[PDB]
């Protein structure tokens, strides 16, 4: 149960509420996810206008439940087990030599649609740094999301470090710390240590005048 909800294409809605150094923005996302192949397709819109932060910083924050979990690994899929009731996702993202994001998100089914609603607060960002000041290349590298059971929280923790390309040639690191807890009262799947290999392509809709991001992503589970 919960597995069944992802056999096939599921519609997605993402809403992001962001406050960074007294700036504010709202991102809205739509698209489809297909967990049997591990594919997300999504168009994001800055409803509140030109962003204060580069879109790539928002990628990890802007539905890991669409992750593809192979047949032998299926008992380790915590994300889909929390469904439909869903789960909570909290992150602390440390931008090396820069500010940090704190995020809280709820991911649950709402009728037909898989919804991810997020709150993000960003403190201590250098203005004219890589993040404020927009020095990041419009792209995304491949990453492994290391997942570990968190038994006393009835959820999971995750670690990874995002490599953001800087326009001058250097890299900007972003240490992710992650925590996921169910919204309901169980029972829930708790996995052996493993990780999610992810690949991502950021593009633009050529017809679209609003500040925005089109994203296509592939995620498969591995390590067992
Ligand atoms: Cu707000």
């Amino acid at each position: 149960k919960g597995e069944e909800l992802f056999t096939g294409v599921v519609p997605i809605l993402i809403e992001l509420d962001g406050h960074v150094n007294g700036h504010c923005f709202f991102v809205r996302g739509e698209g489809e996810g297909d967990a049997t192949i591990g594919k997300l397709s999504l168009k994001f819109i800055a409803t509140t206008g030109k962003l204060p932060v580069p879109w790539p910083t928002l990628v990890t924050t802007l539905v890991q439940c669409f992750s593809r979990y192979p047949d032998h690994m299926k008992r380790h899929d915590f994300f889909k087990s929390a469904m439909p009731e869903g789960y909570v996702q909290e992150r602390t993202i440390y931008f090396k030599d820069d500010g940090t994001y704190k995020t809280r998100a709820e991911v649950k089914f709402e009728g037909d649609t898989l919804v991810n609603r997020i709150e993000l607060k960003g403190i201590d960002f250098k203005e004219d740094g890589n993040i404020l000041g927009h020095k990041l290349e419009y792209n995304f590298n491949s990453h492994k999301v290391y997942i570990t059971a968190d038994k006393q929280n009835n959820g999971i923790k995750a670690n990874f470090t995002i490599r953001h390309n800087v326009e001058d040639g250097s890299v900007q690191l972003a240490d992710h710390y992650q925590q996921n807890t169910p919204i309901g009262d169980g029972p829930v799947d708790l996995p052996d240590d493993h990780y999610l290999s992810t690949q991502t392509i950021l593009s633009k809709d050529l017809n679209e005048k609003r500040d925005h991001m089109v994203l296509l992503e592939y995620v498969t589970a591995a390590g067992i």
Side-chain angles (χ1 to χ4, degrees), residues 1-184 186-224:
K1 303 175 194 168
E3 260 174 40
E4 325 258 22
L5 301 174
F6 287 87
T7 67
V9 170
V10 168
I12 298 169
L13 171 73
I14 293 156
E15 286 167 7
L16 170 58
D17 176 12
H19 301 272
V20 185
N21 296 22
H23 295 65
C24 87
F25 55 82
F26 194 79
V27 174
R28 182 173 301 268
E30 294 180 22
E32 313 176 328
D34 186 353
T36 67
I37 56 170
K39 176 204 206 219
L40 297 172
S41 179
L42 292 171
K43 179 185 189 180
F44 296 88
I45 295 280
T47 67
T48 54
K50 280 211 162 174
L51 267 58
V53 292
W55 279 105
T57 67
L58 303 185
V59 165
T60 64
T61 302
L62 281 185
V63 293
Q64 269 177 336
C65 43
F66 282 99
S67 291
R68 189 187 161 258
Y69 273 77
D71 282 357
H72 68 275
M73 279 187 68
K74 270 190 166 54
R75 63 170 288 262
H76 304 282
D77 196 346
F78 160 82
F79 308 106
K80 294 183 193 60
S81 68
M83 298 298 166
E85 286 201 342
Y87 61 77
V88 173
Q89 192 169 283
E90 317 200 42
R91 286 205 186 108
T92 299
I93 298 156
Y94 300 113
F95 297 86
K96 188 166 156 202
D97 302 309
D98 222 325
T100 81
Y101 288 168
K102 302 226 185 106
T103 67
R104 182 179 179 278
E106 290 183 3
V107 181
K108 183 178 179 180
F109 269 74
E110 288 174 9
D112 174 33
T113 293
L114 187 143
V115 187
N116 180 29
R117 297 212 173 77
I118 317 157
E119 294 172 310
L120 177 153
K121 186 81 175 188
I123 58 182
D124 294 338
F125 283 99
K126 297 147 134 150
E127 50 198 349
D128 197 358
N130 280 331
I131 293 79
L132 300 173
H134 297 87
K135 295 172 186 188
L136 302 192
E137 288 287 294
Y138 189 69
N139 58 30
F140 218 77
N141 296 323
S142 308
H143 300 92
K144 305 166 69 145
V145 172
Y146 298 94
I147 288 180
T148 194
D150 194 353
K151 290 208 174 191
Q152 68 183 353
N153 294 29
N154 199 43
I156 59 163
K157 286 190 172 74
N159 291 97
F160 51 105
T161 299
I162 294 291
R163 314 181 307 277
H164 288 126
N165 287 354
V166 186
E167 74 202 346
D168 60 7
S170 54
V171 177
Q172 175 77 57
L173 298 176
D175 290 322
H176 287 55
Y177 299 80
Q178 176 164 338
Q179 215 185 178
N180 283 69
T181 48
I183 282 179
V188 72
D189 295 343
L190 297 320
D192 292 336
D193 291 1
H194 70 281
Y195 65 86
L196 305 168
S197 165
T198 79
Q199 298 179 83
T200 316
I201 295 175
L202 313 181
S203 63
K204 302 281 192 190
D205 181 335
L206 298 185
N207 304 122
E208 174 62 62
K209 291 176 283 205
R210 294 168 287 169
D211 195 345
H212 72 284
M213 169 186 95
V214 181
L215 163 142
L216 182 51
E217 193 163 295
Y218 272 64
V219 180
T220 314
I224 297 197

